[PDB]
Design a protein around this motif. Structure first.
Motif, short mmCIF file in Angstrom:
data_model
loop_
_atom_site.label_atom_id
_atom_site.label_comp_id
_atom_site.label_asym_id
_atom_site.label_seq_id
_atom_site.Cartn_x
_atom_site.Cartn_y
_atom_site.Cartn_z
N UNK A 105 0.74 -1.16 -0.06
CA UNK A 105 -0.05 -0.11 0.01
C UNK A 105 0.70 1.27 -0.25
N UNK A 106 2.17 1.18 0.07
CA UNK A 106 3.10 2.28 -0.21
C UNK A 106 2.84 2.93 -1.63
N UNK A 107 2.16 2.38 -2.35
CA UNK A 107 1.91 3.00 -3.67
C UNK A 107 1.02 4.15 -3.68
N UNK A 108 0.19 4.29 -2.57
CA UNK A 108 -0.79 5.22 -2.18
C UNK A 108 0.18 6.01 -1.23
N UNK A 109 0.56 7.15 -1.80
CA UNK A 109 1.54 8.19 -0.85
C UNK A 109 0.57 8.66 0.48
N UNK A 110 -0.49 9.00 0.27
CA UNK A 110 -1.55 9.40 1.43
C UNK A 110 -1.63 8.32 2.60
N UNK A 111 -1.54 6.98 2.04
CA UNK A 111 -1.67 5.92 3.04
C UNK A 111 -0.21 5.78 3.86
N UNK A 112 0.92 6.05 3.19
CA UNK A 112 2.29 5.80 3.74
C UNK A 112 2.53 7.07 4.58
N UNK A 113 1.90 8.14 4.45
CA UNK A 113 2.38 9.39 5.00
C UNK A 113 1.18 9.58 6.09
N UNK A 114 -0.10 9.25 6.06
CA UNK A 114 -1.18 9.35 7.18
C UNK A 114 -1.87 8.33 7.71
N UNK A 115 -1.77 6.89 7.18
CA UNK A 115 -2.30 5.81 7.53
C UNK A 115 -1.32 4.98 8.17
N UNK A 116 -0.13 4.51 7.57
CA UNK A 116 0.74 3.59 7.85
C UNK A 116 1.18 3.69 9.41
N UNK A 117 1.12 2.88 10.01
CA UNK A 117 1.54 2.80 11.76
C UNK A 117 0.75 3.05 12.58
N UNK A 118 -0.58 3.78 12.14
CA UNK A 118 -1.70 4.48 12.90
C UNK A 118 -2.64 3.35 13.32
N UNK A 119 -3.73 3.57 14.41
CA UNK A 119 -4.48 2.78 14.65
C UNK A 119 -5.69 2.80 13.78
N UNK A 120 -5.21 2.11 12.70
CA UNK A 120 -6.28 2.20 11.47
C UNK A 120 -7.75 1.44 11.74
N UNK A 121 -7.66 0.64 12.81
CA UNK A 121 -8.98 -0.01 13.21
C UNK A 121 -10.02 0.87 13.65
N UNK A 122 -9.38 2.19 13.80
CA UNK A 122 -10.56 3.11 14.23
C UNK A 122 -11.37 3.55 12.98
N UNK A 123 -10.98 3.26 11.88
CA UNK A 123 -11.60 3.72 10.66
C UNK A 123 -12.94 2.64 10.41
N UNK A 124 -13.00 1.74 11.08
CA UNK A 124 -14.00 0.51 10.94
C UNK A 124 -14.81 0.22 12.38
N UNK A 125 -14.37 1.03 13.36
CA UNK A 125 -14.95 0.98 14.61
C UNK A 125 -16.17 1.34 14.78
N UNK A 126 -17.15 0.57 15.14
CA UNK A 126 -18.70 1.05 15.27
C UNK A 126 -19.46 0.56 14.21
N UNK A 127 -18.73 0.28 12.97
CA UNK A 127 -19.36 -0.31 11.74
C UNK A 127 -19.65 -1.66 11.95
N UNK A 128 -21.02 -1.89 11.31
CA UNK A 128 -21.74 -3.34 11.12
C UNK A 128 -21.00 -3.97 10.08
N UNK A 129 -20.40 -4.90 10.50
CA UNK A 129 -19.49 -5.86 9.51
C UNK A 129 -19.56 -7.46 9.96
#
Ligand SMILES: [Cl-]
Ligand SMILES: [Cl-]
Ligand SMILES: [Cl-]
Ligand SMILES: [Cl-]
Ligand SMILES: [Cl-]
Ligand SMILES: [Cl-]
Ligand SMILES: [Cl-]
Ligand SMILES: [N]
Ligand SMILES: [N]
Ligand SMILES: [N]
Ligand code: NA
Ligand SMILES: [Pt+2]
Ligand SMILES: [Pt+2]
Ligand SMILES: [Pt+2]
Ligand SMILES: [Pt+2]
Ligand SMILES: [Pt+2]
Length: 129
Positions: A105-129
């Motif tokens: 996913x380093x192909x997406x520069x915004x992912x590397x700079x703003x998502x990589x290494x972060x608590x990404x699970x927060x983005x699906x928290x509360x969601x019905x899945x």
């Protein structure tokens, strides 16, 4: 279409993106947030003359044809316009090819700079899945 956060998470899961190439759903939702703010019709011109398209801002230099990027390829074999649909199938299919390209996913520069290494699970928290 401007997806809701949990709406996009559900769509991305339906289309096979959860844990695809080892990247959890939160990584994909996070990437979409900072690439397009969940807007399928997002476009952005790059200095080299290529253009980024769709929820994951897929680029015309390698991945899609828009007919105005000299010397470019079309490795996903789609018109770039297909990446702007309310249906994210084309974007997902192409993104799977991109993330398998070698650099993940380093192909997406915004992912590397703003998502990589972060608590990404927060983005699906509360969601019905
Ligand atoms: Cl949000
Ligand atoms: Cl996650
Ligand atoms: Cl072209
Ligand atoms: Cl085309
Ligand atoms: Cl969809
Ligand atoms: Cl799909
Ligand atoms: Cl990887
Ligand atoms: N799908
Ligand atoms: N799919
Ligand atoms: N969908
Ligand atoms: Na192209
Ligand atoms: Pt739309
Ligand atoms: Pt699908
Ligand atoms: Pt698939
Ligand atoms: Pt927002
Ligand atoms: Pt769908």
């Amino acid at each position: 279409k401007v997806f809701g956060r949990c709406e996009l998470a559900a769509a991305m899961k339906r289309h096979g993106l959860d844990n695809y190439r080892g990247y959890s759903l939160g990584n994909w939702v996070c990437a979409a947030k900072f690439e397009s703010n969940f807007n399928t019709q997002a476009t952005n011109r790059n200095t080299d003359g290529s253009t980024d398209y769709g929820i994951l801002q897929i680029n015309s230099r390698w991945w899609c044809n828009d007919g105005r990027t000299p010397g470019s390829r079309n490795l996903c074999n789609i018109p770039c316009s297909a990446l702007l649909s309310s249906d994210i199938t084309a974007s997902v299919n192409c993104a799977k090819k991109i993330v398998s390209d070698g650099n993940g996913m380093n192909a997406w520069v915004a992912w590397r700079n703003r998502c990589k290494g972060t608590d990404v699970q927060a983005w699906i928290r509360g969601c019905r899945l």
